[PDB]
Amino acid sequence: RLTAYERRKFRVRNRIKRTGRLRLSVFRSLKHIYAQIIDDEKGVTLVSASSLALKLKGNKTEVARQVGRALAEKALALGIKQVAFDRGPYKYHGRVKALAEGAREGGLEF
Amino acid sequence: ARIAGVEIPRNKRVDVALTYIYGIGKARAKEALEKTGINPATRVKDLTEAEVVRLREYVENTWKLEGELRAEVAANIKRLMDIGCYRGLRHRRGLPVRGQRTRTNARTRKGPRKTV
Amino acid sequence: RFVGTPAGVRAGGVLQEIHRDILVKVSPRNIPEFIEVDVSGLEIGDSLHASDLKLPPGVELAVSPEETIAAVVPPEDVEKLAEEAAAEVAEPEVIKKGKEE
Amino acid sequence: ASEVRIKLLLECTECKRRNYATEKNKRNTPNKLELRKYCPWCRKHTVHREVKI
Amino acid sequence: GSTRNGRDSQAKRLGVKRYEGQVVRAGNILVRQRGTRFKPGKNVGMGRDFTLFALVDGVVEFQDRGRLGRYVHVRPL
Amino acid sequence: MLMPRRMKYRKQQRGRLKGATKGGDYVAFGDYGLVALEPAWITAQQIEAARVAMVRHFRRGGKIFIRIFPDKPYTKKPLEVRMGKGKGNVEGYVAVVKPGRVMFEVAGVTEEQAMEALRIAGHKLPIKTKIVRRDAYDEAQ
Amino acid sequence: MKEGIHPKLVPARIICGCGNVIETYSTKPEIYVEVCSKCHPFYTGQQRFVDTEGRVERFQRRYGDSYRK
Amino acid sequence: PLDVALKRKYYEEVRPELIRRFGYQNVWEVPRLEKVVINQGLGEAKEDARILEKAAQELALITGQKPAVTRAKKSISNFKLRKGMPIGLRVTLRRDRMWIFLEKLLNVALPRIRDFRGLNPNSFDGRGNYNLGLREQLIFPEITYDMVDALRGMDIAVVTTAETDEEARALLELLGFPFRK
RNA sequence: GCGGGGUGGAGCAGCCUGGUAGCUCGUCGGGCUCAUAACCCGAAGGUCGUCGGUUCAAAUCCGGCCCCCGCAACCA
RNA sequence: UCCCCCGUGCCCAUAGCGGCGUGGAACCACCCGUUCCCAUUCCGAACACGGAAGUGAAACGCGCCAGCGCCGAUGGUACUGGGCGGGCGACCGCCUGGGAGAGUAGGUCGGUGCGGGGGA
RNA sequence: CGCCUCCUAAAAGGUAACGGAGGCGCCCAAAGGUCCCCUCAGGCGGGACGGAAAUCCGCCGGAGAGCGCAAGGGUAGAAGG
RNA sequence: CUGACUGGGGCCUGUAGAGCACUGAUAGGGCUAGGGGGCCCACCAGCCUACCAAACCCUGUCAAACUCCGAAGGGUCCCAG
């Protein structure tokens, strides 16, 4: 018996894997916001970035943008360039949107 | 639904306006106007809120009205019908109670004629 | 063992022994030779269930207590043949397919 | 198609040529169709109007 | 005496057209079907009538993923 | 007499009568049984006639269990028509019966009373029969 | 909330017929009511209002005990 | 958030009394008011009145909140009802508006009811919620006799975080819900 | 076999186009007459042969079954 | 490499329903507000933002119980590719290779890959 | 008498009979494209007019609903709203 | 040298059999809305049913257009004779 959350999550993710790109998935909790780029072909995380691991500060939006840049910098160093944005159950807006725009600013391709 | 559960007709004289309440005729209307000292000839659209709250408070406390009065009339008949007395039979067949003729007339207790 | 002769049986009825035994969880050392059941109070048409089964020590019911176990039912009668034969049967209707179903 | 469900043409409002054929219900959609379609003559999208077939 | 029956429709010749281990080219039809009995997998697209067709040159593979249904894959060569 | 109250489909292909019974091969209600020895389509007219024989024997008493039901529609074209012009009309219903099935069971009657009633009913049937009583083999099923 | 579609709630004063004033919020600041919880017969314990009768029937005759015995 | 009479009463007199009477080991196990959902099942506005905005305007005064429309989920011959027809209103009052409504309902409306002999005790969900029905909208103070064209009642749903009827019965009576038995 | 019907007590509409049962007669009540017929003024009564189905809803569309009308049943 | 949590897959109910128990340091959650981004066919319920007083009550995670759900042998059997016999038939047997379903015994209140946060 | 669905059809495809059963000769300007949300039938309980069924509240409910129309396949991790 | 046929290997399938989880059928019993019937009432309910019986549960079964299951075989590609 699924929930609007689960279905929303599923529906947008299936759509992403179909295109077969590396996926920049984003979890966003009440305090923190994490992000990993995954190869669903192999079932393997390739590059990580999070507020909790970067010990970052105040405004969650401004924080996100920073973890976004963090992810992109670590990313390009690995040869990863293009990627697909898994917005999960979260509307592309605010914190999540900011994380994306940060990844873009950092030179990530999506 | 001002007093007492019924909203008495405005633009009419206060004595008659009270008769539109269940439990109050012209009689109990002449009473509550002295016992509260209000002019019987004035309109309800001309009543002081003071005159209002007094007439209301008195009438709801001195007499049994609307739903409760209807309740006892019902309760009074319910028992007469239940004890098995003649007064109860006439309430159970809907026939005239007060010893009138039933050969003709009696149209108010029965209802419109059912010809044959 | 259905000990006793039901009153329904005296009226001509028949004791239909639905369960002639019952499923039970129990110790191997604890196996009863049988289990008695009083059917003497059975009328047409009354019945007992596994709930009404009074058990020996150490044996536990493995079926629903709601499970019916025996009943007393009316007997065949030739008087029924005449009225059973007089019962006229209407044709079998059809569950339809398509714009009817 | 039918008596009420008609067939029609779409005429590029700029060069006046007919570029598409389709259908509509003239009881449900009594107004002349307006639709943006790619005109091969003009080589760009253009508003096309319903015109009698 | 007559009947209201007597009709039927042209057989539609549906089913799997390439089985697992078979080499296919880009565009080869793999499964013909009504609805999704098989679902498009790796390197496999689906047409407007649920037709499964190879997206790349390679070899076909089937995998049955339980409650997720059956899937058809083309493995690049 | 015995027939379905309704069905999805009116006419049924004839099928085949190969093999031993599918199930229903053990006593399950009464004390004594009547078992089919060879396959047949047993008509509703026969079943009822076989029943009536038994209740008539018991006069009053006993209980009759009928463990077969005619749900198969029997078809037949009108007299003197030629082949073709569709399938025939339904003229009765039969119960498909393969060797080994307990068709009838009696209960609540003396042994000699059951032996005779099942024998008599046996004569109304278009097949060979065998009378059987409840065993532990039946209990274990 | 959505703007412009909703009635504005402001501090309010519902005045009862017993003189009671209720501090609340409403779409209208002043209201006069004929009754409240503080004077309604069902609320105020069990004010018998006007019918403190006690049935009164059927033994309520006693008119009288003067008959012969 | 506005401090309101009935709300403050919940935390000061109602909250503790319940922890006493039932003995909860956690602060959230205590009964809370979830939401009050007011529904005007109307349907008198089917064909006849496409105009029932008076009732929306009325409910907007009562609850300080504009209701939404409810429409027919399926067509029905007997009610002269085709699928998708607008037959009712429903406003969901939560938080401070939920309190404000109940406060005015408990202190003013329920009393102004004709022959009000107490709310029905047995109208309890079983799952710990309560529902009650009014026959007039004149019961509310904001609605004078002048601004009413025709009578219309409503359904009131009160949802509780309570698991059982008894806990639900307590919370509401403590808040001031009068029952007949 | 092919076509057509079954609806107040009688005889016919309504069906094709789904929602909305109508006309004459008869019937009951009352007028006029000594009374009666005629005549005048009022009113009642059909869940549409059934069983199933389509639909939001069936006298109405569709199917099964009963019954009645008409035509056909040839070369052989 | 071992333990706990947050992510994300895989296997696709031995992983589920119900019952009980346990966890808030950290993480997650509910939670505190609705100024601001954004939002409600009404509702800050949801989505969203800014926060960090509280609580692990709901949720979720981890355990335990076989009442239900799910898995399920071995054995026998039905059926059968192929080879043969029998009956007037409906049908019935033999050899050889394959071999169910039901049921029985029994199993199960998950397993595992990658990445992070914490601990030893 | 052409076309569609199911069975007959003997577990690939195909397979006949005046064999068993139903449909089509339209439709939709949204009933189409995309993006973003939303999840049914039914059952028990609760609620003015309100009824077996109008709208509201709660719990249970893997899909038995829905998908314009026959049937089948499909399908809520949507193709449904 | 690719052929019929054959050895191994993968993949597709819904028949034989069987099953009742879906759609229907179904005998008996249990439990139990609905009627029918009787004592009982009009004042609104009772109560008993050797009556017809819904849904559900149990025992036992039926189906070309039912399938929770499901062979032997069969089709096809690869390597080999």
Ligand SMILES: NC(=[NH2+])NCCC[C@H](N)C(=O)O
């Ligand atoms: N091994 C086999 N394939 N046997 C075939 C079974 C059928 C065969 N006609 C018989 O009666 O036995």
Ligand SMILES: [Mg+2]
């Ligand atoms: Mg993996």
Ligand SMILES: [Mg+2]
């Ligand atoms: Mg009066």
Ligand SMILES: [Mg+2]
């Ligand atoms: Mg007199």
Ligand SMILES: [Mg+2]
């Ligand atoms: Mg008299």
Ligand SMILES: [Mg+2]
């Ligand atoms: Mg004929």
Ligand SMILES: [Mg+2]
């Ligand atoms: Mg024909």
Ligand SMILES: [Mg+2]
């Ligand atoms: Mg064909």
Ligand SMILES: [Mg+2]
């Ligand atoms: Mg074609």
Ligand SMILES: [Mg+2]
């Ligand atoms: Mg053909």
Ligand SMILES: [Mg+2]
């Ligand atoms: Mg075909």
Ligand SMILES: [Mg+2]
């Ligand atoms: Mg296939």
Ligand SMILES: [Mg+2]
């Ligand atoms: Mg496409």
Ligand SMILES: [Mg+2]
């Ligand atoms: Mg494989």
Ligand SMILES: [Mg+2]
């Ligand atoms: Mg693959």
Ligand SMILES: [Mg+2]
């Ligand atoms: Mg025969």
